[PDB]
Subunit: 327 residues, 4 copies
């Protein structure tokens, strides 16, 4: 008799099915930062990794597995073949091509043309969380290819940039980012919209204390805080070659709202046709209620007409780009 | 329109189907300790509480709900009606009768509770904590109709944690690093498996062959004695115990909810193993995961340790033979 | 020869000094709720409990200790003598006195603090004091006056829980988690507390701007009643289970987290606010306070209406009047 | 009036002093893995990073800082100047030189010693009372080096040693047995790497000796070849390096576990490298992994594992070998 059989008597003959499974697609720096952040938050009972770089993929799986003693996620699997991803509650897309342009978008679209059908094949009921850049466009692409209802296709959107904003705000005010509130909405990147009217500590409107807030006439140049947010990815890439930890943490926080059905409000990109004056099939970041069914509700933020037009402009540019894509 | 609708545009017709729901039956000091321990370990997306004292029940629910901001368990519900427990993955029974013929009244209690539980959560695991726990776990099992892997008694889980704590005080290292197993029938008849006690793989019995005997100058036998009495001592001091039992139950909930397949000293239907031939529940090292107990470790026992477990089997069966459901 | 010495080679002598010790005074339901919450959030490397009911005390300690395997707080101690509390970073006061009369009730709590607070200060000169005992604003004043600590190191839990309740109820009406609902209750703890309607918001969207009637008696939705619900909820729960424990426990653990981790988060807690919010007297009220390893280091100056400002002035007069009549 | 003063009234002049500060030296993949693991277990109220590559250092600091919203460590600081590490409770050394073509392994070690000769005095100067946790390889030798350079008492100089390899061993044990690593117990002791000692006698689940169930356990005559599990442990770093070019996540998790025992004074028992002269029959000043009680004063106690004659022979041999290399180093 084998030692295992001498030691342990099997009483139950049982099967598989994971109950809180999460898949990360793409094991680059971003994918793996999402992975370790999720593992250390105890968000999943099974974690699947997939990539096309099979050695890298296997090496990352093994490195995570060796840390089992220290985690509470009993199963970590990987493979080039998407069957490893079966029955995921949530699938996180961090795959992309790397730096032309617009031809860069099409190559990412071609990457998605392969990934997304495979994901939906083995997890017809998952939530899709897209992190790949450009995220608003790629999230729309995942949505179109997947055939999912819009509530289940989510883009990381402005979630990290709002967190950065709050950190910088916290630096200026001498309080933790947790206590500093402010929203960056709309199109992820240089065109994102800092909603000066919403910024506050303990319910106290900064814009009201300080009417020049966010304008060129602002002696304190709060406008530059937003630009610092917009530039920070660029600045960090410049220093270390990429970013990982913050985006990883931010993605894990979204996963928490989903897997625990918290219905917290996050600034993430959702298909918002019919809201905010927008008439195109596009994804923009607005405050969304996030739960076990993905995005079920959207907060309607009161915007200035300047903010509204800026949001409509992003929709039209996003749509303009989406028309040139081949599916 | 209502302020909610001015503030919030609804995009989805929301079905609330709980995914990782846990129920605690009985909101006494034990149930509520299990509750707060589970809430603070983030093991459920929904907690249900059930009891027959409706005022107490509603008040406890409300008190937990009020701490929502500090928790990550978005839904907490309660009621005397078991519809509130629907679709639980795990249901924890702390219900018990007010003070033999007690077990009979506890059995009567279980005759009402269990079918109500099974009706609303057909697929749940059952974790019995009520005393006498090995007997009531057998009752829960029989009444429930469930296969044996899905019915679990807290058994010697806590007493083992107590033993390791006391081991750690004597040796000067954390209980986590002191290993020792109390098995068999919960209570005074439980078995201190001297041979398995160790730190870092070093057998204490081999270092100290007198370990656990009368001739032991260090009197380690009194450590098991102290574990078996400790509950009585705490009740004497504060009227009941709560925190330790609550923490130990949350630990089991954790292995279940996260499918960890850790080994715990808990009470399982072990007919067929350890020389036992009756439908009884005794604590052995069990692999605990999303399907309950799926495997048990076969501990190498001395001939008298063996005879002691068999005696408890016949003891329990003897008591079970009287009960009626 | 001894087994321990056979198993274990000792290399280092004991210099055992606590690095992040918390004491909870009072092991009633509130006290133990704070203790269990603190233990399960790993805020302390040593916990001490003190009370005068010595059986109950020892019993609570042992029960906690039996849970060690499942905790990461290696040392739990207790005693009637305050030497067990020495070198606490944080000492939490939940002790209280058990239809006549109010002022006479307060005085007997003062009497308890006259015994407790000096004992705490003697053994933990550098600690922060966090008072939870009712009425908390007054009793936080008494702890401050008695202890002789600077005001930054004496904190009352104040309206911290009530704000948390307010956000929970806000969340139930709006269909989102309380974490994402923001509202502030300030001022005197209890039914004199002030709901600051102008700061209530989700995602920076002002509810009052959306709904100008918010919190007036001219509100078809009666949001004013949410504050009342908050105010009443404590006594409703008391009506139902005899007391409250779990939420106040978690509330206090949250404050302990900001202090022990120096988070400088903002909480609505009771601070000596003479010289702010138009308050002239030595009075403790709840305002949004920056909370960290040195206690309360900063206060957020909320913009209040003249009515709201008047409410706080009134409470300051009430509290000051009562304190005027206390025997220290 | 500045918006901040308009919004916030300052009641206290702050002289900030960190209470549970951890420093990580070296922001390579290993350093940042320790760093993220520590941050997500809330073990420090301040984290400091140091390295010689200033851009890389600043980038990593900023990336972590941008995650502040999701963390409960209010202060992350970095700099090439060791003033940023002042008053750390724990300083974790992951700095190393990488081989060339080229140079012998001794010349690679000496270049690491050269690195430590610059780092260790800087660390000791700003945090005289810290514990040192050395992770850099070869770990037993470089932990010896930090001990000697720092002048710290031995209880305060700790090498990660066989901690991770024992974790790997329990994981692989759990895969064969169908049980979580948490419930599989087994110890890799002695010199980190090839010459480490799998202590078969101590392997168990639930206190059931595997060796007693299966006396061939760990022998060549073992038909189940459990020795191959030790070889797996020994080769796992190389195997992972072949696939992804380095390891990070596991060693990072294992380091934070040690950090946890130290910062919380847990007095858990870990397989880590300590100065064991005078114990285990060792006559030399060397560091070997044995089961150590780890707390706020570092390693206060070691467990005395009963070893077979051939196990004792391996350790004493490793001692000679380490001491031999040590005598060849320039301090
Ligand atoms: C290249 O092909 C593939 C690559 C894959 O690997 C993806 C991954 O490894 C790489 O994206 C890489 O590691 C980058 O680092 C990650 O870049 C990201 C990803 C991300 F989600 C977010 C950010 C980000 C966001 C915000 C900020 C900030 O705000 O700070 C910073 N960073 C950066 C996978 Cl899994 C499949 C395919 N493809 C296949 O499945 C085959 S089909 C196909 C079709 C076409 C092509 C082709 O044309 O190339 C290739 N394959
Ligand atoms: C009484 O009726 C009922 C009471 C109920 O209340 C339950 C609860 O509140 C009480 O158990 C109370 O909190 C006890 O104190 C808790 O005692 C326990 C419970 C437990 F699980 C473990 C321990 C324990 C273990 C180890 C240690 C240690 O080792 O340290 C210490 N402690 C102690 C419920 Cl939910 C339903 C019914 N019944 C109904 O559903 C109606 S049907 C019915 C039938 C018959 C009878 C009757 O005959 O009376 C009554 N009802
Ligand atoms: C009786 O004396 C003492 C009693 C002591 O026991 C304390 C404790 O066990 C009891 O407070 C018990 O647990 C209460 O129930 C808890 O009630 C509380 C306590 C609290 F902090 C907050 C809340 C609260 C807050 C908000 C909400 C909500 O908003 O929901 C709900 N609840 C409720 C101690 Cl440690 C020392 C002395 N005293 C001594 O040290 C001797 S000196 C002395 C002097 C005078 C007197 C005398 O006048 O009698 C007595 N002793
Ligand atoms: C180059 O010099 C320096 C390098 C430094 O490097 C920091 C960092 O970036 C690098 O360690 C890099 O990331 C490595 O790759 C990481 O490699 C490691 C490190 C480690 F701790 C453990 C493991 C490990 C363990 C187990 C397993 C497994 O079991 O799985 C896998 N991996 C792998 C620093 Cl902060 C200062 C100096 N130097 C100075 O301070 C100036 S003094 C000086 C003296 C001499 C020399 C010279 O000779 O060159 C240079 N400087």
């Amino acid at each position: 008799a084998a030692l295992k059989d001498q030691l342990i008597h099997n009483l139950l003959k049982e099967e598989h099915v994971p109950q809180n499974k999460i898949t990360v697609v793409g094991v680059g720096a971003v994918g793996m930062a999402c992975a370790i952040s999720i593992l250390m938050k105890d968000l999943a009972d099974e974690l699947a990794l997939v990539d096309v770089m099979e050695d890298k993929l296997k090496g990352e799986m093994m490195d995570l597995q060796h840390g089992s003693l220290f985690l509470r996620t009993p199963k970590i699997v990987s493979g080039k073949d998407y069957s490893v991803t079966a029955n995921s509650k949530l699938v996180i897309i961090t795959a992309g091509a790397r730096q032309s342009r617009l031809n860069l978008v099409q190559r990412n679209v071609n990457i998605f043309k392969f990934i997304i059908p495979n994901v939906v094949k083995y997890s017809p009921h998952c939530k899709l969380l897209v992190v790949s850049n450009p995220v608003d466009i790629l999230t729309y692409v995942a949505w179109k290819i997947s055939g999912f209802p819009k509530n289940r296709v989510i883009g990381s959107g402005c979630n990290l940039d709002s967190a950065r904003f709050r950190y910088l705000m916290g630096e200026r005010l001498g309080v933790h980012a947790l206590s500093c509130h402010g929203w960056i909405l709309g199109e992820h990147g240089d065109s994102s919209v800092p909603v000066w009217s919403g910024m506050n500590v303990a319910g106290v409107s900064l814009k009201t204390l300080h009417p020049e807030l966010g304008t060129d006439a602002d002696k304190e140049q709060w406008k530059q805080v937003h630009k610092q947010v917009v530039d920070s990815a660029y600045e960090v890439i410049k220093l270390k070659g990429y970013t990982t930890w913050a985006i990883g943490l931010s993605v894990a926080d979204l996963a928490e709202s989903i897997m625990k059905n918290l219905r917290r409000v996050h600034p993430i990109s959702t298909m918002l046709k019919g809201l905010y004056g927008i008439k195109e099939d596009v994804f923009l970041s607005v405050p969304c209620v996030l739960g076990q069914n993905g995005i079920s509700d959207v907060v309607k933020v009161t915007l200035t007409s300047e903010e509204e037009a800026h949001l409509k402009k992003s929709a039209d540019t996003l749509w303009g780009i989406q028309k040139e894509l081949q599916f």
